[PDB]
């Protein structure tokens, strides 16, 4: 039937998975070379299956990315009659448009690779910008942490009713209107032009800066200040993909948030043990339930607009 | 090397404007529609080893301009020539260009791939309404800017420029807006229709110029006009790169209150003139003569991206 | 199981279709800009599933294949398990060779498009030339009215034993000759050199202009003069595509046919109001089971020589 | 720039006439067959950023031949030549150009595959069986026509041409001969196989010249030639672009009632001729190598079809 | 479900195959021009179905091979939803390497050709270098002999515990190394330098000379003279493929082998007539074998380390 | 015509050096890693038109020099240069190009499809692992040898060349080291590990000279050397074209018998010979930089593989 196999050694997203699938993730055995050269060979057969691949949430993206395309490539020439890439959190993302520069469009080079690797269909989570999904000529599902985060608002903030969702920048407003929209607040934006503008109102209200993903915090925690000197009460982040590298943990240990809330789309153990703002939804289930009803046929549509 | 430059259908203003100042004549090309619209096109000369443009029409008509155009790049493609590029001032069906949680097509991706396989070799065009569509293939793209244009346009002709509002129609237009708000050293200002239009920013006792990359119907500008004249906008300009212009059309842009309506002539607008005496178009046919020019040549078009 | 969808507004041969197969059409949701740039947005889900779309006979050509294509890539991109394109009337079919010009083979560009659009299987009926099954590289089902015209001639020609079959020009042989053998009557070939020529045995016989398809008829309606002018009893003719457009109809209204039968690849209510000559024979059937064959694994070879 | 001419196998007959043409030596290939006729080829010099010519060989055995191109068109292709042309006089498997209702392979867009893959990037062919086969490409084919050269040969040859009549040996050829009779401006008829011979058209007292594209056993145009003598032709030539002429091969011919049966050179007739003094060939090469010299120049080799 | 055809005229090792599976071959309708031109039609529908085409041993490599690559393009074209390419001796295997030469890399053509005929998975068997696999982006099962190989020495050489494995060449090691590792003996090596040297004990020991394929065996008859030379017992040779082309027959009847034993991958029948050296090993269970485990998602890894 | 040659990584040595050698500076790059080593590129001039070679850094992380070489590759592609080189000394994952008996991927078919997704049209290298690996792309690879400058310093630096041993550490280089030895006109020998170390060829009061493509660990080769001096060797050098040197890396040199250890700078070797006084490096340099020079002027870089 169906087959799950994880990246690497970050087995925790796809072990939470596989668990709520009622399966054992596939045995798959692994040497790396000092280069970090990737070795793998997949420890059992995966003729005439459905192979889903979960990404590693390693943290050296080029290591993570490679052994992904590497096990793809082993699944397809071992007659794999398919092969799903699970990536929850995808690579290079942010490197979607050349904006003026001799920029690679790295994300479209990112969809390449997948594609000649062998992958038939890629199910992620918040794609930067949803044009990503243009970058392939497969099926793509890009699911969505919206309700998921509509749900942690209306369960974690009492004065949701009368909050006011803020965007960090110019390009995220389409995302936070659509969620001010759906609990019926107001929104705001931020922009950094080295100075950040306001507009919207979030004059005693809760502010809840929303966005995809946070990865050093530089601007969401400068955003908070500026909402803060504004009038708002207090003010939340709420990230879908929670990168936190650099000084990101400190930023946000120094910051004036009530709470950091992000998915488990990137593992976040170790960086709530040194960071207590931090709170963690849980998206497995979503992921889950996407890959069981795409091995069966079923609708995933459910899932935008709904928690499983 | 010499080229040669092909206009699709009888639109062949810009073609003819663009071979002008290349000190070229355009190439002879037959055309003949033969029951359903069917079309047929016959290159009338060799183009044997040559390095060939064509121009999409302006023809209005969407499906038959981008037939056209595929056809045409087909014909020079089995008739040996060269190289081919096409410059596609409005890219047709941009703004299909993601799922938007629906089971819908990504057109724009279909239209990057017709083109790809009818043969382009490289692709010329302006202000695409996702950067991310460049993504859409895997041949060189070339996105020029109105920006530059636009911002000479403002300084020139509105006054109170240095004191303006910059507003965007929509939630999706924040980045536009906020770049050319940044560069004219301005305030900006965004309106959301509800899912009633709210505006956040101010534009009180002020000069207000709403920015589009495009206007079709124009409901949606014109409505912006109104509230942002209950705002308390002082005149109200809108300011679109590609005037589609069609149905409730002109109409709605005399009945509204704009000081002005400019555009470019990326789309044809000599007929909408007549029926509107507010509408002004910006030449755009220098800067695609001079990115072919350049591009032929192996010299930076990129400087083109920020200068007129 | 599997999925019918009618290209357009056009249900008319779908809805038969789906009616023969026990069936109701997917739900489609349409919206037409003023450009008449598509929109469709499929609605329910095509997961996993085999998609039959069924091509428009909406008119307009290029509109028609673009709402193909847009289908096509919307159902492949919502992770369509297959997806097969049935085109009764293949477009720009009769653009399939240079002959001496520097043309589009435009019927190849028509193969490519639908082939990048994601299109896996290609069910058609009597392409213009069969050489175009090789412009594509999947499975093209290439079915023949052939079956539907010999018992539609043997019941309603009473001498049909001793009846000429004539081809209209010289590139139409082989159909007619292969009909005349099947009857066991004698075959004749028009030629336009501009004045027609006959050979081949037509005096006091019944004579049967077969052809492909019959477009703006000056063709045709030449060819029935000739052929009583050389002394057939009377004539008919006998096209597998009826467009008909231009002056068709009023060159057919005063032609001396005794009738003119089409199928119904192409709508023909309209036209047969203002056209009493015109005949329908529905085809629908062989069509219907064409895909009942093809989703079955069953053979289709059957409907070469046999009506269902 | 400077090309280089190769030849396949040691047909070199076509090969260095055309090479002569040019003012070229052919290009060193190193040639071995190693046991079950396993082809092997080495280049015996550097083609490394030059612009390759292929002449397909005259090795009669089909496979062989083919496989030969194919292996000097990889050679070349992996050695950096910077463009390769096949020249293939003959196009093989141009008969199997469709499925005619069987479960039949169509092998010459197998082969049209083949060579694209091969890394072929333009092919020079003359008398395609079928024009459409140019579409099985998606590169560039230049399709030669014998047709100016047989007129002329015809003019030059047949006292009575000016009232002769053109047959053609099949139902299939109609629009072959009537090209050719309408330039000559005389009568055309045709034969078909009942499936006896009939014919239609008149040939009473007049000389008949069968013109095909291709014969083989020629037991269709030996047939065609006595129904021609039967119905009472004056004399009958056959005019083959093509002459493959195996098997009963020549037996035939001289046992058959032609005047003269005149082919051209693309495939070699040397051999062929000793054991027939009927036989005629017309030289092409000149055809292909101008083809040739025009191709690398940019100049229009359209010119061409019409003329010698 | 299943459906087996065979390549050509040798039906020898595929019927041996499909009486294995419990089924009888698929019927093929086969014609052959003069110039060995190959004509096929599919003698049943294969709509539907997974289809397994077993390449002759005919002889003739080139016409062996175009003739599958044909019977694969009309399976695909023919709706067969899967080929897979049987070919127990991979043609143009040999030539996988440029080696300081303008060569062509033909078993990436072959590789190539067999992937745009449209084949979907290969089965072979001891691809003379295993990169081979690499050739293509499907997936490509190598089955070994080794298993089989070792199992005949055991049986027919009493001495096998106290032999050793020679390598006729420098190439050969590894696979010589891994058997005398196996059977846990000694291995040695020749290399043509023209003369061969040896390196490895052979002294008072059988030598078994284990290569994957014999042509002309040139190579392996002066092998067992130096092997003798230098103190060998006797001498055996065992290789996987047995062309025997050339005077392959007349230097094993002259050559000082105890026995020459070779698989069935090439038919052998004729050969041993004229050979009594010759002893053969039926591989069709394993082949057998591999097309049942494959068709049911089984696992093929077995057939690596044990015989069927 | 003018050519553009930029560097991987800040590794510019061999890039640098490369530069020299041509009389260019290496174009400007701009190169910063985001969080997760996510890899920024962006290059500093114009591309457009130029044929550029980009040369693979050293910058050890495997991972990371190959996504940055992608990344490179695919900026200067959608750049509009219009050819880009990749020069790749040491090609990652070369020792992953079969699957030998294991559900293992054929990583360096990946990585060669990688690099021809990313839009390279011509690769340079230095001793393929295994020269079938040119066979995993379409497009013209040029392998470069070490082997004349290791014969030089072989014959320059070693008296008792003349009568020395060739000694390949492992069965699979057997080819590598008969190649050399039949040159210096020397004997050979070979080790194998069984599956302790065994020796066969003779190497008593002779110097052993260890040749391998690459060393990583040198676990391998540096037990091949005891066992060589347990064998009775003289002196044994180890001669590998590739020096990884990880890990264990130069502390078993050190402690191994070695009188010298030679590589190539295809990988930096700077700080390696800090710790290892018995290192040497042949600079490979003017080889790449000759390959790249002839490669843009159309000369026979051929002559290159047997000189230096
Ligand atoms: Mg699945
Ligand atoms: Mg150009
Ligand atoms: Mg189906
Ligand atoms: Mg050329
Ligand atoms: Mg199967
Ligand atoms: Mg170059």
Same mark, same amino acid.
Request: charged share 20%; glycine share 6%.
């Given at each position: 039937?169906?087959?799950? /196999? $994880?990246? $690497?050694?970050?087995?925790?997203?796809?072990?939470?998975?596989?668990? *709520?699938?009622?399966?054992?993730?596939?045995?798959?055995?692994?040497? %790396?070379?000092?280069?970090?050269?990737?070795?793998?060979?997949?420890?059992?057969?995966?003729?005439?299956?459905?192979?889903?691949?979960?990404?590693?949430?390693?943290?050296?993206?080029?290591?993570?990315?490679?052994?992904?395309?590497?096990?793809?490539?082993?699944?397809?020439?071992?007659?794999?009659? *398919?092969?799903?890439?699970?990536?929850?959190? /995808?690579?290079?993302?942010?490197?979607?448009?050349?904006?003026?520069? *001799?920029? !690679?469009?790295? +994300?479209?080079?990112?969809?390449?690779?997948?594609?000649?690797?062998?992958?038939?269909?890629?199910?992620?989570?918040?794609?930067?910008?949803?044009?990503?999904?243009?970058?392939?000529?497969? !099926?793509?599902?890009?699911?969505?942490?919206? !309700?998921?985060?509509?749900?942690?608002?209306? #369960?974690?903030?009492? #004065?949701? *009713?009368?909050?006011?969702?803020?965007?960090?920048?110019?390009?995220?407003?389409?995302?936070?209107?659509?969620?001010?929209? =759906?609990?019926?607040?107001? /929104?705001?934006?931020?922009?950094?032009?080295?100075?950040?503008?306001?507009?919207? &109102?979030?004059?005693?209200?809760?502010?809840?800066?929303?966005? &995809?993903?946070?990865?050093?915090?530089?601007?969401?925690?400068?955003?908070?200040?500026?909402?803060? $000197?504004?009038?708002?009460? =207090?003010?939340? +982040?709420?990230?879908?993909?929670?990168?936190?590298?650099?000084?990101?943990?400190?930023?946000?240990?120094?910051?004036?948030?009530?709470?950091?809330?992000?998915?488990?789309?990137?593992?976040? #153990?170790? %960086?709530?043990?040194?960071?207590?703002?931090?709170?963690?939804?849980?998206?497995?289930?979503?992921?889950?339930?996407?890959?069981?009803?795409?091995?069966?046929?079923?609708?995933?549509?459910?899932?935008? $607009?709904?928690?499983?």
């Amino acid at each position: 039937n169906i087959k799950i /196999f $994880s990246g $690497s050694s970050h087995q925790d997203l796809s072990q939470k998975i596989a668990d *709520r699938l009622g399966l054992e993730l596939g045995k798959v055995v692994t040497k %790396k070379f000092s280069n970090q050269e990737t070795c793998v060979e997949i420890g059992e057969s995966v003729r005439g299956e459905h192979v889903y691949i979960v990404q590693s949430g390693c943290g050296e993206i080029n290591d993570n990315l490679m052994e992904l395309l590497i096990m793809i490539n082993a699944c397809k020439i071992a007659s794999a009659s *398919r092969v799903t890439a699970v990536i929850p959190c /995808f690579p290079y993302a942010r490197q979607d448009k050349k904006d003026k520069s *001799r920029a !690679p469009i790295s +994300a479209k080079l990112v969809a390449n690779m997948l594609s000649v690797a062998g992958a038939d269909h890629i199910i992620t989570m918040d794609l930067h910008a949803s044009q990503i999904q243009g970058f392939f000529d497969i !099926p793509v599902d890009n699911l969505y942490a919206e !309700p998921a985060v509509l749900k942690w608002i209306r #369960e974690n903030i009492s #004065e949701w *009713r009368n909050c006011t969702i803020v965007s960090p920048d110019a390009g995220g407003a389409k995302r936070v209107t659509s969620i001010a929209d =759906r609990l019926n607040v107001d /929104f705001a934006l931020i922009h950094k032009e080295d100075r950040m503008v306001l507009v919207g &109102d979030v004059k005693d209200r809760v502010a809840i800066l929303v966005d &995809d993903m946070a990865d050093t915090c530089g601007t969401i925690c400068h955003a908070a200040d500026k909402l803060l $000197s504004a009038g708002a009460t =207090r003010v939340y +982040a709420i990230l879908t993909h929670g990168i936190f590298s650099g000084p990101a943990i400190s930023r946000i240990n120094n910051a004036c948030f009530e709470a950091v809330v992000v998915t488990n789309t990137i593992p976040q #153990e170790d %960086k709530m043990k040194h960071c207590s703002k931090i709170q963690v939804i849980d998206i497995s289930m979503i992921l889950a339930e996407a890959i069981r009803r795409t091995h069966n046929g079923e609708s995933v549509s459910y899932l935008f $607009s709904h928690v499983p």
